[PDB]
Design goal:
The structure is a homodimer. Chain A is mainly α. Chain A has 6 helices and 3 strands, in the order H-H-E-H-H-E-E-H-H. The longest helix of chain A is centred in the first third of the chain and has 28 residues. Chain A binds a DNA duplex (22 and 22 nucleotides) through helix 4. Chains A, B: GO terms for molecular function: DNA-binding transcription factor activity.
DNA sequence: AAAGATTGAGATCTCAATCTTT
DNA sequence: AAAGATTGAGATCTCAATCTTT
């Protein structure tokens, strides 16, 4: 039997709040200004960044840190509104590509500045360089920790 | 209305991943070992901590940083499985109390150690004291920033 | 009216089952 | 068989509408 010290509780509690408030603030900013939730927007960003604006489903899920299932549903929804389309992998008749359409790229161009502001104002404008450095070192460890290479691990995109 | 440096962009990414992986890891740990998602478990923890193991709805929402709507739905679900019950406020026939049942308390006693481990292994076991200090200072600013007292704001529990 | 809280519908996420291809 | 990916059902969250009490 362990437990958390009161000091640790304060750290953890303030993490939980912050995260829950950020996701809320950003989801809302994106739902009004761009018509989609934060996770979806992130998918478009990752494709926009990819070679030929495309990425195979599992690779997309891996970057997003979500499950293939969630990704499929999300891309059905994004395909419906025309921001994304799908193609077959030619060498492997099993794979599928998610490709960002022109119109999808135009929604990023239209909305990103808004979304960037919101992410600035909530976070980066409030932290000294030292803490920005410190935040990234910290989250990278937490992330690294939760996606080890070790064999039979429970990674979302391998679910 | 400036741009984000590439460094800042990378910090932000690694934040998003970490958070998305933690919520995933903890939701799953709590869904198997305790039969409920992380946010719900939090509600039980806050009541367990409260005087008389009870708290009025809006107060509960304010601690949890969620909306009243989400809270009502969540407490219907917790009431159904018997971990929570409701009472009327006697002075104000408008208010409602959320009270943690005995059996609900027994689910915390049973599961907390598991949940604490999972939160240790993912986070605290991986950070030096300096970074634990640093994390809390950082998130507390982000949180404080997103819930100002200054009236014309969009706080979940006031939605 | 506004405050406290709930409701139902539709959107999304999770889980398990399924299909095809390797 | 396992890998890549999708489906549908049920669980949960959001949004707007609603009800009761102040």
């Amino acid at each position: 039997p362990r437990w958390l010290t009161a000091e640790e509780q304060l750290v953890w509690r303030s993490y939980i709040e912050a995260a829950t408030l950020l996701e809320d603030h950003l989801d809302r900013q994106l739902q009004r200004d761009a018509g989609m939730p934060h996770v979806y927007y992130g998918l478009l960003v990752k494709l926009a960044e990819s070679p030929r604006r495309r990425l195979r489903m599992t690779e997309l899920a891996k970057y997003a840190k979500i499950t293939r299932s969630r990704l499929s549903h999300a891309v059905a929804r994004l395909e419906k509104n025309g921001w994304v389309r799908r193609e077959d992998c030619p060498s492997d008749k099993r794979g599928q590509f998610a490709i960002l359409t022109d119109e999808g790229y135009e929604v990023l161009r239209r909305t990103a500045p808004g979304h960037v502001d919101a992410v600035r104002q909530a976070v980066f404008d409030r932290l000294t360089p030292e803490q920005q450095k410190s935040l990234g070192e910290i989250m990278r460890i937490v992330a690294e920790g939760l996606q080890p290479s070790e064999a039979g691990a429970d990674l979302p995109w391998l679910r």
